Amino acid sequence: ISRKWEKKNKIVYPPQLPGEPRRPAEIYHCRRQIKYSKDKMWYLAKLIRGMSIDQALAQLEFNDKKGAKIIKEVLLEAQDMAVRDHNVEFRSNLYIAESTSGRGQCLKRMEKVYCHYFVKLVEGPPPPPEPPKTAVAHAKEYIQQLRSRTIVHTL
Amino acid sequence: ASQVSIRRIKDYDANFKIKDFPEKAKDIFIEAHLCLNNSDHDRLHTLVTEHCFPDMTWDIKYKTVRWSFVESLEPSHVVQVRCNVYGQITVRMHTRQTLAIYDRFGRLMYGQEDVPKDVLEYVVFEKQLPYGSWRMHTKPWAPPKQPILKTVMIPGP
Amino acid sequence: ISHGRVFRRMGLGPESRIHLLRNLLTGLVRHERIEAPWARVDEMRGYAEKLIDYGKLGDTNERAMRMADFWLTEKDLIPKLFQVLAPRYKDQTGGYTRMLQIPNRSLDRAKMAVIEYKGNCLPPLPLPRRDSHLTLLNQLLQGLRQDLRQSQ
Amino acid sequence: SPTELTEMRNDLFNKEKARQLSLTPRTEKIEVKHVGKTDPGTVFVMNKNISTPYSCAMHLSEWYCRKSILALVDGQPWDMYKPLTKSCEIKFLTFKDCDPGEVNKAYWRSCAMMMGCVIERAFKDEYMVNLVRAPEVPVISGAFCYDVVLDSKLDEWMPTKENLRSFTKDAHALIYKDLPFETLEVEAKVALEIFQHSKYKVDFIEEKASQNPERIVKLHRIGDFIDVSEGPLIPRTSICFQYEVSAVHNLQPTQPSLIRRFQGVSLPVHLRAHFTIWDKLLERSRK
Amino acid sequence: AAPKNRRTIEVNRCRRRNPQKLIKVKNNIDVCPECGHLKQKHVLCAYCYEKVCKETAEIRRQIGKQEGGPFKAPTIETVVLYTGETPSEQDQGKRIIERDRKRPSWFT
Ligand SMILES: [Mg+2]
Ligand SMILES: [Zn+2]
């Protein structure tokens, strides 16, 4: 029983200088004791891993699994808290920075499974996906490796 | 004016420095508003009662306020005092403040840094009528308001 | 192998299949709109169509009366079939029922479907319209309408 | 030396932009009421001369930003990036509303401006290209036209299909670059006190505001390019997906010069048209 | 039979997180262009359908209250009329199911 996640919304950074880039805000949120396995919640958690909040809600509204509505309620509460307390400007300017599912506590009869859901929303637009490794990049790195060979085992 | 209520003050306190009251009031005002910028709310516990301490401390957590006092426009003069009695004393004050609140990530969300600007106050101190000492208790026709840096939405009914 | 078998398999056998479809069809004739699992409605649509076809022949025919006796269970509906539904479609020669898909069922996440008899009194289903005729692509296609009509 | 003319335009453009933006007196607040069947009855509280309709759209949902293409405030079209100015009423116009009139007009004049920023730099520096105008044509017509005047040395040059292909590739580069259409309201004197290089648009510049009671005009900027148009433009150049300049025309009264006319046709990402329908549409972009 | 060896977390991760087992991102969601709610293309707007089913249920409750009991399927058409709506010239001889709220804008 460790309540660490909800304590990362309390780190008070130092007041920004007028020069440095505006720091993107954050909000951490968690749902505890979801009556649902973790090896099933993981798929929903990974689905919405790298997409903005509104697309995530859209994708969850139309998925069949039982945990979809739990994740949706969690994300809505997170968005409301982010606007109301964490001084976020636009409630659509958020994206799922981290989404994960973890084990839970309660007892057996045959384990009665439980799970927690952990979400970190980061202000700003989604980062673009890592592009595919173009053939020129592969040739460039192969040349780099060919050009770092030294005479092995001598002066 | 209200000498009938102030008779209780004279009887109980037995000191009643009437003209020193503005000085003490200004001192406690600047002190209380001075220690809102350090997370050192323990002394703010004894500088304000539980009536208006919980709001003055909870709605400021995770907000790096940096207040400041720069001048008093004119000397502060006492106002009418009324008075199973907690002694409430109201003091009018024209002061010169600067204020710059920040969010828990360090981004400005109210006021400018120096911007030394004037403020009008109807402050009200209260004190147990014993050991309990002076405590700020409360703070206008229609003075203007400085906007917020943030743009908001008000949903429909 | 199931090449060219048009009948679904449902219920506890052929007979239970006919009885399930019969209850669905009776509900449809009684209320004129029912929400049921998609596959069952798709199986029952053909039967509802042919029921209206039999009902057009009218009371006097005996074959149609026997058929509507079997396929309607609360007999108060047989009047309706022969005096409200079949008369209503004296013009249409086909397609008396519209079938849509709707949000999956909350409990068992089955594929649902609302099926109704065209022209009833009920509030209209939110049918999906096509794009307005004034949209960019439609406007360009309208220009092509004109320019092709004049040439021909 | 055109490569310095662009700088001579942009420097003063940014100068006026900055001097206008600096006029705002410490972030005043305005209230924007939202009307329309979707999410009705909301009250945005925006910044008097900083927040744009996008700043309102993003408040509602990513869907509004992705789908919105123009903004009505006080019931007149208003570009998405153009700052608001007073407590107003707002609504968002898309491509799929029942009456996408204003949106279609804005889309096509924006495509005209893009074709301008493509053609101008298309030629070899030793030639002299001068943009005449973006003649407003109805969407029903079949293509958007842009009137330019080439130098007299090219009278014996009707462009070949390969050069049109090059034009199209360059325009596709422009859309692929994904630059916005910044706007700027300016007093009409910029066109009469600096822009001496306006030789044929020297006529349009009085058409800007000589007709309207006020003495202010609209400037639109793709980025290291400037030109006027008669209405709002779509927010990003990425909106266009299918694009093609088909051919060119000439007007017979060849006394002033050869007023070449460039035809093009395009569609947004939303309203993509299948391959064969697109071929048919192109065939009619040659009239 | 039975396993001969435990299977490691690596093999289990190469099975459980294989793409074939992942949840696919749906490419067919959009916004009801007029109503402004989420929907799939080939399916009805859920909010609109619920607001239709509510009215259908209210109409049917009135129908039941008027027909009395079971086994009373009428032999004539039916028309439903909201407040301040006299039976039109086309609806005479058709059962009327009165309702006591203003006709919905979406009811044509
Ligand atoms: Mg079965
Ligand atoms: Zn809808």
Residue C107 lies in a domain: yes
CB contact under 8 A, D45 and B149: no
Q: Which domain holds residue B66?
A: 1-157
As a whole number of Å, the CA-based R_g of chain A is 21
Domain count, chain C: 1
**What are residue D193's phi and psi, to 5 degrees?**
-120, -20
What one-letter code names the amino acid at A1? I
- β-pairing verdict for D70-73 and D88-93: antiparallel
Cβ pair D40, D26 in contact under 8 A: no
Q: Could you tell me which of B7, B117, B115, B29 has the C-alpha nearest to residue B76?
A: B29
In chain A, the DSSP E strands lie at 26-34, 94-102, 115-123
Residue A63 Cα to ligand 1 midpoint, Å, equals 24
Q: H or E stretch including D29?
A: strand D29-34
CB atoms within 10 A of CB A126: 16
Buried b (16+ CB within 10 A) or exposed e, D238-247: ebbebbbbbb
In the structure encoding, which two tokens stand for residue A29, read together?
Answer: 């949120």
Contact E95, E79 (CB under 8 A): yes
Q: Are strands D144-149 and D130-133 parallel, antiparallel or unpaired?
A: antiparallel
Q: Which residues contact D61 (CB under 8 A, 6 or more apart)?
A: A54, A92
Nearest to D33 by CA among D46, D17, D20: D46
Distance in angstroms (rounded) separating the CA atoms of residues C128 and C120 = 18
Size of interface C-E (CB pairs under 8 A): 67
> Which amino acid, C42?
D
Contacting residues for A78 by C-beta, under 8 A, at least 6 apart: A27, A29, A119, A121
Residue type, D9: R
Contacts of B11 (CB under 8 A, 6+ apart): none
Asked if the Cβ–Cβ distance from A62 to E38 is below 8 Å, we say yes
Helix ranges (DSSP H) in chain E:
9-16, 46-67
Other CB atoms within 10 Å distance of the CB of residue A15: 17
Q: Residue A10 and residue B151: Cβ atoms within 8 Å?
A: no
Domain with C112, as residue range(s), is 10-120
C-to-N gaps above 2.5 Å in chain B, after residues? 83, 129, 139
- Report yes or no on C5 lying in a domain: no
Whether E95 is covered by a domain: the verdict is: yes
Number of structural domains in chain B: 1
Question: Which ligand has its closest atom nearest to the C-alpha of C103?
Answer: 2
- Report the gap between the CA of D93 and the closest CA in chain B (Å): 20
Show the domain range for A80: 1-155
| Whether D39 and E35 lie within 8 Å, measured CB to CB | no
Phi-psi region of B111 (alpha: psi -120 to 50; beta: other; left: phi over 0): left
Instruction: Judge contact between A121 and A27, C-beta under 8 A.
Output: yes
Phi, psi for residue C15 in degrees, rounded to 5: -60, -45
Number of domains in chain A: 1
Q: For residues A8 and D81, give the distance between their C-alpha atoms in angstroms, rounded to a whole number.
A: 36
* D164, D279 Cβ separation under 8 angstroms: no
CA of A60 to the centre of ligand 2 (A): 18
Q: What single string gives the DSSP state of each residue in D55-89?
A: HHHHHH-HHHHHH--EEEESSSEE-SSSPP-SSEE
What resolution in angstroms, rounded to 1 decimal? 2.9
DSSP state string for chain D: -HHHHHHHHHHHHHHHHHHHHTTS-S--EEEEEE-SSSS-S-EEEEETTT--HHHHHHHH-HHHHHH--EEEESSSEE-SSSPP-SSEEEEEE-SSSS--HHHHHHHHHHHHHHHHHHHTTTS-TTS--EEEE-----GGGSSEEEEEE--GGGTT-PPPHHHHHHHHHHHHHHHHHT-B-EEEEEETTHHHHT-TT-SSTTTHHHHHHSSSSS-EEEEEESSS-EE--SS---SBGGGEEEEEEEEEEE-S--SS--EEEEEEEEEESTT---HHHHHHHHHTT--
> By what method was this entry solved?
cryo-EM
Distance between CA A115 and CA A100 in Å, rounded? Answer: 10
Whether the CB-CB separation of B137 and B88 falls below 8 Å is answered with: yes
The phi-psi region of residue D98 (left if phi > 0; otherwise alpha if psi is between -120 and 50; otherwise beta) is: alpha
Token couple for A128:
């673009």
Partners of residue D44 in chain B, C-beta under 8 Å: 151-154
- Alpha-carbon distance of D204 to E62, in angstroms, equals 68
Q: Where are the alpha helices (DSSP H) in C8-152?
A: 14-31, 38-56, 62-71, 77-80, 86-88, 136-151
What does the longest C-alpha to C-alpha distance in chain D come to?
62
End-to-end CA distance of chain E: 67
Q: Which residue has the tokens 């396993």?
A: E3
Distance CA B97, CA B34 (A): 11
Residue D170 token pair: 């360059």
What is the torsion angle, in degrees rounded to the nearest 10, for the CA atoms of residue B44, residue B50, residue B52 and residue B57?
A: 50
Q: Burial level of D217, CB count in 10 A (0-12/13-18/19+)?
A: buried
Residue E23 touches partner A, C-beta closer than 8 Å: yes
Whole-number Å distance between alpha carbons of E38 and C104: 15
**Nearest residue to C116 via CA among C137, C102, C132, C135:** C102
Residue C130 lies in a domain: no
Cα–Cα distance for residue pair A44/C66, rounded to 1 Å: 55
What is the rounded CA–CA span in Å between residue D42 and residue D34?
5
What is the Cβ-side half-sphere exposure of residue E15, based on CA atoms within 13 angstroms?
7
d(CA A104, CA A102): 7
Tokens of D26: 């410490």
The rounded distance, in Å, linking the Cα atoms of D202 and D184 is 19
The CB density around residue A108, as the number of other CB atoms within 10 Å, is 7
Identity (one letter) of the amino acid at C17?
Answer: R
E70: its two tokens = 């079971």
CA distances from C87 to B109, C25, C58, C99, E97 (A): 71, 18, 9, 21, 21
Within 8 A by CB and 6+ apart from B146, the residues are B110, B111
Domains identified in chain E, total number? 1
Rounded distance between C-alpha atoms, residue D201 and residue D131, angstroms:
7
Q: Provide the token pair at D182.
A: 């910044």
Quote the DSSP letter at residue D205.
Answer: H
Domain assignment of residue E74, given as a range: 27-108
Place of tokens 């009902």: C55
> Minimal CA–CA distance to C20: which of C3, C41, C34?
C41
Please check whether residue A121 is in contact with residue A45, taking contact to mean a CB–CB distance below 8 angstroms.
Answer: no
Distance of residue D196 Cα from the nearest chain E Cα, in angstroms: 47
Alpha helices in A51-128 (DSSP H): 53-61, 67-84
The number of residues making up chain A comes to 155
Return the number of CB contacts < 8 Å for D and E.
13
- Contact list, A90 vs chain D (CB under 8 Å): 55, 58-59
d(CA A141, CA A132): 14
Indicate whether E3 belongs to any domain: no
8-state DSSP, C98: E
Q: Are A35 and A101 in contact (CB under 8 A)?
A: no
Instruction: Please list the residues that pair with D90 across neighbouring strands.
Output: D34, D73
What does the alpha-carbon distance between residue C81 and residue C56 come to, in Å, rounded to a whole number? 9
Closest CA to D46 of A89, A86, A88, A80: A89
